[PDB]
């Protein structure tokens, strides 16, 4: 890798600088370099990794949705034939998105997940694994689509099982995992009832555990709780 000659601490420092500069591709490349040093990641370092790639793939997903919408309209009745360009360019963005998802899934598989033994790291990485298979599922159409969906489901489910055994209901990683697995159910798995049930049960169990927290932990948990409520309001 092109980051192989840079010190681990320097890669982490530069990832923070790139974040400040809103240079998320750079941020992600620095954090991939850091992962490839082979040492486990601290809590703060895991957060830099996830923020970097979430922003990169988030932009690709937004662009893919714009292009897919144009493509769909061009395939409606009465639409003037415009040639292959819309499909070609949607395919170009899709392939680049798939490449980023494969890169992240590769980092998790070599070797972040296998060395992650504490709940806060293992659940975090398995949530990421579910997230990036979910992004692959959003664009999947061929023979492999059901297997991609089940890979997302499997990763989310292992993360869910660990989080319920090992973390309090208000833990922000547990909450964000449930938020996203609920969206997986609604948007990917065609299971809106499961999505609603999960979001409601998660919210209610967190409500009942807020009394144990400091003010700073309370702020963190209620932030994601409001996203659960927002989704429930969208869905009901």
């Amino acid at each position: 890798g092109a980051m192989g000659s840079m010190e681990r601490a320097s890669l982490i420092q530069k990832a923070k600088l790139a974040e400040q500069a809103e240079r998320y591709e750079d941020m992600a490349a620095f954090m991939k370099g850091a992962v490839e040093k082979g040492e486990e990641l601290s809590c703060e370092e895991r957060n830099l990794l996830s923020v970097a790639y979430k922003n990169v793939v988030g932009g690709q997903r937004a662009a893919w949705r714009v292009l897919s919408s144009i493509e769909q309209k061009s395939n409606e009745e009465g639409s003037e034939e415009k040639g292959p360009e819309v499909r070609e360019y949607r395919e170009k963005v899709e392939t680049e998105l798939q490449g980023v998802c494969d890169t992240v899934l590769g980092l998790l598989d070599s070797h972040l997940i296998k060395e992650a033994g504490d709940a806060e790291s293992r659940v975090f990485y398995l949530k990421m694994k579910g997230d990036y298979y979910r992004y692959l599922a959003e664009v999947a159409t061929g023979d492999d689509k059901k297997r991609i969906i089940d890979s997302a489901r499997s990763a989310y489910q292992e993360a869910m099982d660990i989080s319920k055994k090992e973390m309090p209901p208000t833990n922000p990683i547990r909450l964000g995992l449930a938020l996203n697995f609920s969206v997986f159910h609604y948007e990917i798995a065609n299971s809106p009832e499961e999505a609603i049930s999960l979001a409601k049960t998660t919210f209610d169990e967190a409500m009942a555990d807020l009394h144990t927290l400091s003010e700073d932990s309370y702020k963190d948990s209620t932030l994601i709780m409001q996203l659960l409520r927002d989704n429930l309001t969208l869905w009901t």
Partner: peptide, 5 residues
């Protein structure tokens, strides 16, 4: 679209 983190 719904919220994810």
């Amino acid at each position: 679209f719904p919220a994810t983190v």
